[PDB]
A paper describes a structure:
The test proteins used in the analysis include human C-reactive protein (CRP) pentamer, CRP decamer, human erythrocyte [name], SARS-CoV-2 spike protein, E. coli PaaZ and E. coli β-galactosidase. We performed a comprehensive examination of how macromolecule orientations respond to alterations in physical factors, such as freezing temperature, and chemical factors, such as the addition of surfactants or the presence of affinity tags, during grid freezing for a standard set of proteins.
[name] exists as a dimer of tetramers and possesses D2 symmetry. To visualize the surface-charge distributions of the proteins, electrostatic potential maps were calculated by assigning charges using the PDB2PQR server at a given pH and were visualized using ChimeraX. It was observed that the charge on the preferred view was positive in the case of [name], neutral in CRP pentamer, CRP decamer and PaaZ, and negative and neutral in β-galactosidase. Upon the addition of [name], an even orientation distribution was observed for CRP pentamer, CRP decamer and [name]. In the order of homogeneity of the orientation distributions, the surfactants can be ranked as [name] > Tween 20 = Tween 80 > A8-35 = CTAB.
Numbering used by the authors:
A (entry chain D), B (entry chain B), C (entry chain A), D (entry chain C): 5 to 501
The structure:
Amino acid sequence: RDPASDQMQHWKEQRAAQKADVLTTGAGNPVGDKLNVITVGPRGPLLVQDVVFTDEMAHFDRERIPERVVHAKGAGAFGYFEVTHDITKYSKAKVFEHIGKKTPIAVRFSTVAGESGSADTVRDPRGFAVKFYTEDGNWDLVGNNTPIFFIRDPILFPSFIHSQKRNPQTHLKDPDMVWDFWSLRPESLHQVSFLFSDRGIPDGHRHMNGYGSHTFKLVNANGEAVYCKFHYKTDQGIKNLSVEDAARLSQEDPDYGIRDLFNAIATGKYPSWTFYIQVMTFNQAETFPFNPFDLTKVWPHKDYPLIPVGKLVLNRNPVNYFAEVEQIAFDPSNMPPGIEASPDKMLQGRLFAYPDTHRHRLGPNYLHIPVNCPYRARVANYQRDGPMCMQDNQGGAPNYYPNSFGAPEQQPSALEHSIQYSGEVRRFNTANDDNVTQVRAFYVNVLNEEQRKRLCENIAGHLKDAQIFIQKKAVKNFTEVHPDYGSHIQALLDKYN
Amino acid sequence: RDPASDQMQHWKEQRAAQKADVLTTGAGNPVGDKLNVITVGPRGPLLVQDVVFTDEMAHFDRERIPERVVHAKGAGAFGYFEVTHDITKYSKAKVFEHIGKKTPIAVRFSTVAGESGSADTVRDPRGFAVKFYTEDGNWDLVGNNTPIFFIRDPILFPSFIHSQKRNPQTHLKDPDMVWDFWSLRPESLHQVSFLFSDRGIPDGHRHMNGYGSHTFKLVNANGEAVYCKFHYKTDQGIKNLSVEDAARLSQEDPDYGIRDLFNAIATGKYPSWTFYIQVMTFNQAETFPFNPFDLTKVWPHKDYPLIPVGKLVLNRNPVNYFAEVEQIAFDPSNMPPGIEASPDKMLQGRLFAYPDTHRHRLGPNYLHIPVNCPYRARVANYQRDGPMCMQDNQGGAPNYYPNSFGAPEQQPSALEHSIQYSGEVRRFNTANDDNVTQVRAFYVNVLNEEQRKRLCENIAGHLKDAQIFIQKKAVKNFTEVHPDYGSHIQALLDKYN
Amino acid sequence: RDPASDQMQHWKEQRAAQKADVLTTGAGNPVGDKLNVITVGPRGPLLVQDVVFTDEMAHFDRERIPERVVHAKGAGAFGYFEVTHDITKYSKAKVFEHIGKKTPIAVRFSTVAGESGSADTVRDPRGFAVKFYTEDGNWDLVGNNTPIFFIRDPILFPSFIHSQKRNPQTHLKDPDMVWDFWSLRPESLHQVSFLFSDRGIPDGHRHMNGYGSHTFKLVNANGEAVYCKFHYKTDQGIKNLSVEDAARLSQEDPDYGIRDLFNAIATGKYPSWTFYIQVMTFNQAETFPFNPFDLTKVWPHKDYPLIPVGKLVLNRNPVNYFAEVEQIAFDPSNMPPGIEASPDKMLQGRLFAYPDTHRHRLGPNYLHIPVNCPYRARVANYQRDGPMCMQDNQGGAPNYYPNSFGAPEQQPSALEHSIQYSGEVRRFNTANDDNVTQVRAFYVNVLNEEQRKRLCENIAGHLKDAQIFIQKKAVKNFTEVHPDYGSHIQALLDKYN
Amino acid sequence: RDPASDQMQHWKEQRAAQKADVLTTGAGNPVGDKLNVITVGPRGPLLVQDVVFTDEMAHFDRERIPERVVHAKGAGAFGYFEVTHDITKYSKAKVFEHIGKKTPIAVRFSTVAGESGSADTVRDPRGFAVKFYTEDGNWDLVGNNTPIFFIRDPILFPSFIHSQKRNPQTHLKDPDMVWDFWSLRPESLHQVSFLFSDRGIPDGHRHMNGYGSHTFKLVNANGEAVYCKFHYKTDQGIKNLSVEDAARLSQEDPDYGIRDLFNAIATGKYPSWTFYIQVMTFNQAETFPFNPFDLTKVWPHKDYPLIPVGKLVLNRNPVNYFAEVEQIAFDPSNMPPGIEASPDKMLQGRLFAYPDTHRHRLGPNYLHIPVNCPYRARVANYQRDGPMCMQDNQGGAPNYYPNSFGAPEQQPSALEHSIQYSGEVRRFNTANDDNVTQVRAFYVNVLNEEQRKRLCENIAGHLKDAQIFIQKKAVKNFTEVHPDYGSHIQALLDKYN
Ligand SMILES: NC(=O)C1=CN([C@@H]2O[C@H](COP(=O)(O)OP(=O)(O)OC[C@H]3O[C@@H](n4cnc5c(N)ncnc54)[C@H](OP(=O)(O)O)[C@@H]3O)[C@@H](O)[C@H]2O)C=CC1
């Protein structure tokens, strides 16, 4: 049988020739029995003085923690990232120090929509989270499997998710809400084209690219800075499932992703991604036609060639799923000195948003869990006593700054980068930004005829459930994209209507 | 379209001719805009003084609460229970006071295994929770769709669930663990026969019976007591899905149950259950062949006729799903004066187990949520300040008992019932109890030939994934049940092997 | 006896001629007894089936919620705020709409240092929190009893509190940490003069002024804006305790504040504060000598006359202490359209800081507690399901924005005010700002000789416990203030040394 | 200066000749500065992209955990317990295995009434918690400084505490509630005599005895059992403060206990307690005049001589207060094989009560904190994933019992002890038990005349604040004790009245 099917047997194979341990309570008390409760005779009530039953049950009651607000489903792995090119001219970060550096990494694949226990094979953006344990602490690159996103305003992310998830009264999936929100916000027409294309349903998790999709800013040792995007493309080649094959797999194995990834890791065919960077200088950022920090826009390849940096390989399965996938925390705020944030609105939103949900779900001291703890660095600061602190709490060191008792002092070299902006502070409306150029280029340059047919078929198949006027608004936006696009969509609609 | 598909439209239909309200923050502050964040110019970073974005995001982060440890999936409804017979000779409870009493009820259907978001149509015991708002507070009847259960010892319930759920390392469903636990505990051979029979997959939720399955004890006004079981059978007739139809529906609509129940409630075809009681006197309990409080045994119909009491009808959908299904709490401990607990070990376990998980998941003051609050009675006790108390905290009344300031005093009439037991207090082993008689009667009396064929087919189809020696132990237990049973199972096994 | 001593008797006096209620469980089940547990005979163990004991104990275990990080001790009251002057030329807020408006208010007095249960009469800044239930939601004015504060940088507030509180290893109060932090940050020399003056220990809570101390910004109906400060001064006259009287009261009645305030409210002598505003125009803000938004600076009275607005009166005691003082939440972010935040760094910090601790301590839905709920307005937004939501969750309304189902839409009139700033975005150092002018004016103009003697005595009495070199640095800062000041401090020091 | 005054200096003395560390964020990111926030120019608002401020503030907000429901104030120490006599004839426990065994121990002193931050020197029972890290897991002996307690029924403990704590409406201490509850429950007259005697206020914490006060049961290797009580008496001699000295110290140093204990531990005068056992055989338990398991009764010394076992010495201060005193959990349920619970009602209540509050306050996985973790044993069981699990979660081992993959199996030798009880299961009333004999013996045998005078003075001084009829009921109970007692109390009363 497959490794995922012969897991516990392998455990018995590894733990041969050693005697089985003694079943004890949480507090090391060895127990008499765990196959019967204390009673008053054979047909009598229970006694409170049966402590083992009470302890076991009271710990069993609290086995669940709040699922993530988004990307609930998940499959994780561990590996090491390796450098192959010099980019020290761009960054000071110890992750790009020299050639031949092994940095431990954790990775997690997720589905933005599906809750804990849904069928994985569904038309939804896949999430690709990477965490590097750099010598200067952690770095979290939280990417999507698409180079863009539905919206460009952070204040709309809650509503968006509310539309993508179940109904408030019926508690069902409703295409009505999804298509209403999509038609009202035209800035999404691009991402929709990506979502309903052939690359919408990837082959498990080893056959899909991953994109940073955020305009980061690198600073060199000299203090100069350039804007950049991170990419990483698969070495196993892009592979995607037909709608019928995904439909069959959603019934056969609802968790095909986790099974495939685990079988591949236990088999020895180590999956690998190649790491690329797009670089842009400040003058180019000033002379770019669109807004160079808009999340819905991409950078054309011709004007911005890719630059190889390194590769990712995953060579370890999680010893336990819960402690290494359910309890892992990715903060886009964890950026080492050498990688800064930009004026990109969505990145600014995420910097504040992520740690709050991490404190709610895991616990106020989530940074002390061994999967999150930065063991390749040293933690020393003026954070103190919180709920469930598993460390020594840094002993009796002074806990106020500044002081005069030789306490930890700031590093003057890790200062941030400064750049001047001009204009009033107010609310700017961005609903008037371009939405039709890049999607048109994607339509008439990237796709062939058969893939256009499949795309229109998928969109019509998912859109046939909406109301009449939402359908009219959607097809109006699509004919705004291109006449052929809208005409095909509308034709298949009246075929379904 | 169907009501579940035309929900929000109906809302717009109900709220016609009234102007749309003003979008405000949590604290009633009317907002300027919710379509853009404060920036420093058009391409500048965000400001902290954008309070609305911070508030919205920080509330969006905490939208998830820990899912139930079991029975995560759910569909709820509201109705009223109505009496049609006099059982005042048996109970003092105000729910059975007289003929013509309308008691408000909440009901919830669930699946013991499937987490939040799985396909509903699966071979697993369905849970049937009812809550009566009796004039003397709440009463929670937490039943199964089968008259029995897998085990008879409460200390084994955690392990059982751990076997029924995902693997700890691979995080997949493993038939290995399930069948190992089932073969090691022969007391389950009965329930398995129920689970893998034709009634294992019911038709939505309106086509399945519900059973209390616990030996309760009723006490009259005179103080005399009799043991009893509660039943309630559907008026729409038993209906079940073929394995192929359930397989297709698990892909088409993963939430067929909620959809069907909601469409039926909104259509007007009010589903109804008939309420029956089995009664037994103390002498009968002393002269019963098996243990009359064993959870794996049933009471033969001939010796114990059914007694009609009333009917349940569901005539209201939840106004909001989360506040009326996600936040409802059923405690088998909430039993009004007139319905007592018995020496049944599993009922004793549940009495302590349920409130603990309810305090963990919802909150220490979960009894103040309008869906749980006993509005048909008066709450007055010496419970005080806790986290998030939404009530007046009963004002400045004395908070200690006893006192001399005319505070709430105990009701001397609601005393419990007392009965003497003989024998030492110790651990009794119950693994030597009968496991083969009732299952044999179920096999050779209840079933026809075709249903036997289907049962053996289903068991073999689910068991073909286990190891060799677990298969040998399972077929050994089955041949212990009956030779034909085991022979058919083994034949289909070597066909699959 | 005094009302605070004859509280519960009065309850018995109010509830005369009505029969005592029935003691019930949380779920309305009337109980048999609450003076003995179920046992197996007279000298036997307990039974689990004693549900009432389990429920009572399990609710008693969770009676504590995390105390506030600061201002733990507290005494609260309720009243109404009344207007007496027209300031509509300055603000649009419905709280200053016209003359003769009654706005319900809640107020709370606290001590920044002392934990829950310490002696109130101590040398520490007193906190004065007011909450108006304006027709456009809540407004929280969270003031101090001094017009200034120790620091001017928000990032230093944690360290500051850590110094003011107990030692990490010994868990005692240490003057060493306090005086080290004070000497290292000279910007505090002003507030210290206020803290160790005669007005440091007020007479209970009805004999102290209260100051907004934050530079707010008002906007009129025309859209023009002016900077302002809020003041409110007592009508009972400033009264302060001698160090010996406060020392005696700290032993006699550790809670003198709560007792005095409650006795005064129950006696009928309704305490009252007069509400004043300081106003400044943008040109004045540009031509001000110091930084007009510095928290350590005041505005000289001569150049900025006070403007009366209204008065506060407290005419109601809390019906229950816990539900009306322990569970009240003041957010400086709750500012109605008409009162904006300024570039004041500390106000910006507080806007983000307060709601986070409020979500941690109370609960994610703390805005649903009747003491915090804005009942004088209407809540309608796209916030949804959270832990322990006591409301109807706004029923089955659409939960995404924008939509096309006549949902709540933004109010275009409540837009914020915009003003341009020039200069790079970076870290500015403020440790070089003036610290000696206003403190010198306070010393040689405000105080007489005897009060100077008392101030120097108090500072020396509290400073005699520090190390030698911390003493040298403190007296160096004081001689930087003025030679006589430092010389007196040093003289009394060598007297104590 | 004293060690408690020269703590942090000593740290600087220990960390001489090493360079100060680098101040980093929780996630190892070294920081630029912590003395100023990011602004838009010198007088501009803050930016969200200042991550360090957000992280620091959000962690500072959650620095508080719910204080214990009782015994909030505390002072802790660490040491080792050493055996000096053979009691293997009585117990099998590895703590009493042989002579010369060093078992690590943690100890904590507390005050049952005073909240976190009150003056320690007050008339209230002191709590003495000891935790042994035995080779077979932890053992928690949670004793009082008196051999008795106020009540004998667990269901009354909440009400009792509610009376001892602050008023619900006024939030003050009220002698009315305390004396009403004491007069209504005469079973307390004994403990009151102990509480208001000279030994009510001990000299710090090194000058008071400690008593198990619970009737435990020991079982030998042979399986025979005997009832027992644990005692431990100080080697520094009983020392107590006069009411005037305690009054002065409550103003001078509110935390005299922690200061004294820490100074003594850092000075080298290692405090020591001598460990004694009272033993009783089953026949003696059957022929005892009173109820031998009543919490309000003691065992006369003459009939039951003390048996020395070992001594406790404290030779280590807590490295950090919070992680070693605020986060320590004592469960009277943690009893190694060899020390059992008895039919004592209060011990049965505590066995269930303690772990629930421990799960609420600390966290569902509180047994993983290094101060609570049983490092002298091995934990291996079927408890799994919970909130904030800091361990490896025992890797991919099977998580269900029983199984067939060589998993941890129960220890058949650690079985519990069984004994038969006779009589019905019901509610027995114990308010008719003797309350006057032992208190009379304590009065006329243990005390001299001067101590009687002091006792009556203290009781009158605390009782002068109650109502008239509560005073009459109290003096009636006291004259029930003895005529002279009541007459003295009443005389001093009319002197105060
Ligand atoms: N309360 C009880 O005692 C129950 C007993 N049984 C079975 O009846 C056996 C003999 O007791 P007896 O008094 O003769 O019961 P009866 O034969 O008198 O009554 C038959 C019962 O079996 C139910 N039943 C029939 N087919 C199925 C099925 N495929 N899945 C689930 N339930 C089914 C019937 O439901 P329906 O009412 O729709 O006919 C009915 O309740 C027992 O061994 C037990 O297995 C089953 C359920 C309840």
